[PDB]
Design a protein around this ligand. Structure first.
Ligand SMILES: NC(=O)c1ccc[n+]([C@@H]2O[C@H](COP(=O)([O-])OP(=O)(O)OC[C@H]3O[C@@H](n4cnc5c(N)ncnc54)[C@H](O)[C@@H]3O)[C@@H](O)[C@H]2O)c1
Ligand SMILES: NC(=O)c1ccc[n+]([C@@H]2O[C@H](COP(=O)([O-])OP(=O)(O)OC[C@H]3O[C@@H](n4cnc5c(N)ncnc54)[C@H](O)[C@@H]3O)[C@@H](O)[C@H]2O)c1
Lengths: 376, 376
């Protein structure tokens, strides 16, 4: 017997030049006076003002004060702006960081309580929220189809996600044109994040068939088009394909969740400043050679479906992919101490690690990090 | 570039024995007193009361007065029942016929007009309705994840579908136990209906990547388990695997729509009484040999993705599948006249026919129908 649930209530509009259709959603939903949460890059580049003028007065205010690693203070700061201008909907035009505070601010601006009162403290988020129109500009994190908002508390040293049914965006416009301006180094990291969510989402203990079809489709696209997009940022086909894999791979991690590589990326990112997708890719092919034979050859069928002889052949491609696009293949330059390696193992015992098809023991993490700390 | 919209607002609770969870959905929504629209077979078998008592007062009334091809009068008869008993939600436990009157009667009971006032005339349905909990009992048509309600106007001699966003069921519980009681002949016909909507849904003109990932997963499951479900009606795994492919193929054809085998199946059913799934599969392999080199080798990559050397190897698998499960391979026993063959050509020119990649001219229809008239 196989039991599973599937819920995906985010409408998706895909196509180049469809970011101008924000006026079509604010008129159909009957919503005026919107706030666009976008990084300051799009403000100085005129791309933000181009869509606001196209919306024809639908969007009024703009909020750009937030970090790539967003804090709980920028969420309440964005919530205060919504409370003042009486904003009805929230536009999230950015990467995984601009869309993280948009989900949190749209639900918290309807209460007089801080966003910290629900940040990993057991308190459930109020489901009442403003509508969200996610416009991802990186390909990506797939956050435009998830109910997750990853935040940080600098004054309290806390960093934990918040999962609420009210964080689901109503509409998510995936425009590949907004990804043209992504630098090659970020394109490679965000591309590895798509590949990690696709592979981890498949071999997860909470897998389901609808997510597997999306996971296999997105993974094959990353192996083919991601090197092209890194080398050629203006390649319209390679960018559009990466957006295709990005939103589709997001549909494979919302329910089955992620496993080992995402559990190890949290210490590799927060402690050592390694970007998220690059930290996940740092251990992707490592756990692949471990889970290759689990689930009665199910992972072997995944590799053959995307065009590989075995899983070890697929793990070789993941390694050749990271080298060609300039991603980390080791941690020898960090000069990690035995205390730091032991810190990597203790913090890697995350709830996501238990979703791995093969039980990862502490002796395995100690072997992996000692191998990573001794590799260029 | 690629342009496509994706909207799947149905919640899928898949699992063996999860039909008892009507109480959970009614309690979570805080709803009581529901009307269960089901065929009379499930009442005579006690399966309807097993779920009424499992809901523990959540479901109160039962409606069983509708034909396999549902008439508008049977909808208003069910609508007036909800008006006289004020039910709060609709339970659709049955085939496509039961899930097509549950969509119309849930929206028309809130009004005072007849459901025929929106049947083919073009008048939009009111977007206010009662919640729908779809419990499909075949595998299938996927009506639990679509917004179309195929009806029939017997007094007016018309059979036209109705498409309304308010017809989307809230939750679609897919339980393979409800399919154990399907006779092998109906299993084979409904089984071919899944493979049709998957193959047609893939090579359609309005194809999109999310639906194509689902189309390949569903098609690969039918080739392996459909003969098992036919020769072994109580095979639990074969039944579950057919239920899995049926709901996944529902998401595959709801947006890209159907192509030629569905356009040719409508005259094969209303005039000659051939079941829908059997009438679709009667021409499915014929159009495959036409669309093999279409869309720049796209259908070729589809056949290799599911495990065939080419479409020709897949077309042979379709033929051998129908012979093993006892589906029509020709129309020689009908002894069709030259008038009848030309009558099938006229009616087969349906709007869904133009969705085929290769153009289906009237001469190709005349050639195909004359070929089937000479085939056993
Ligand atoms: N919410 C979720 O479900 C989810 C899932 C995974 C990761 N995340 C979090 O999301 C963040 C990652 O998001 P990311 O992977 O998009 O990077 P990002 O958006 O965090 O930061 C990327 C940087 O690129 C800059 N940039 C320059 N030109 C750009 C352009 N043309 N388009 C977009 N950005 C441009 C942005 O200003 C930003 O500083 C991490 O903090 C990660 O933890 C969230
Ligand atoms: N709305 C949609 O998305 C969609 C898609 C395809 C077809 N359809 C329509 O739906 C109908 C076809 O649905 P179907 O293929 O289920 O045909 P159908 O609805 O006739 O199947 C129901 C019949 O199956 C028989 N049956 C015997 N044992 C059964 C059992 N144990 N469980 C269920 N039924 C049993 C009964 O006679 C019952 O009337 C047609 O009217 C077709 O046009 C709708």
């Amino acid at each position: 017997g196989m039991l599973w649930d599937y819920a995906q209530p985010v409408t998706i509009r895909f196509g180049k030049g469809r970011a101008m259709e924000i006026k079509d959603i604010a008129e159909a939903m009957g919503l005026h006076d919107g706030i666009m949460v976008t990084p300051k890059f799009f403000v100085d580049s005129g791309e933000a003002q181009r869509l606001i003028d196209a919306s024809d007065g639908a969007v009024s205010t703009v909020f750009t004060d937030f970090s790539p690693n967003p804090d709980v203070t920028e969420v309440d700061a964005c919530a205060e702006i919504i409370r003042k201008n009486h904003c009805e909907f929230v536009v999230a035009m950015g990467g995984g960081s601009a869309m993280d505070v948009s989900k949190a601010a749209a639900s918290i601006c309807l209460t007089d309580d801080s966003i910290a009162d629900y940040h990993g403290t057991g308190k459930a988020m109020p489901q009442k929220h403003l509508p969200i129109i996610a416009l991802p500009t990186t390909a990506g994190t797939g956050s435009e189809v998830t109910c997750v908002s990853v935040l940080t508390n600098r004054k309290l040293g806390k960093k934990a996600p918040i999962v609420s049914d009210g964080f689901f965006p109503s509409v998510a416009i995936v425009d590949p044109e907004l990804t043209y301006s992504v630098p090659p180094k970020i394109t490679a990291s965000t591309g590895m994040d798509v590949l990690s969510q696709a592979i981890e989402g498949f071999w997860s203990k909470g897998h389901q068939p609808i997510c597997d079809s999306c996971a296999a489709h997105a993974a094959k696209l990353v192996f083919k088009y991601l090197p092209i997009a890194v080398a050629e940022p203006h390649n319209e086909e390679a960018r559009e394909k990466m957006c295709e894999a990005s939103v589709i791979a997001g549909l494979a991690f919302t329910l089955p969740k992620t496993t080992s590589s995402h559990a190890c990326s949290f210490p590799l990112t927060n402690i050592h400043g390694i970007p998220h997708g690059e930290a996940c890719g740092l251990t992707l092919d490592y756990f692949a050679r471990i889970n290759k034979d689990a689930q009665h050859g199910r992972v072997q069928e995944f590799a053959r479906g995307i065009g590989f002889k075995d899983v070890d052949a697929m793990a070789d491609a993941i390694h050749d992919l990271k080298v060609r696009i300039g991603m980390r293949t080791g941690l020898k330059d960090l000069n990690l101490t035995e205390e730091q390696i032991a810190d990597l193992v203790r913090i890697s015992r995350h709830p996501n690690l238990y979703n791995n098809p093969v039980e990862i023991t502490d002796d395995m993490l100690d072997t992996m990090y000692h191998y990573l700390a001794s590799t260029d």
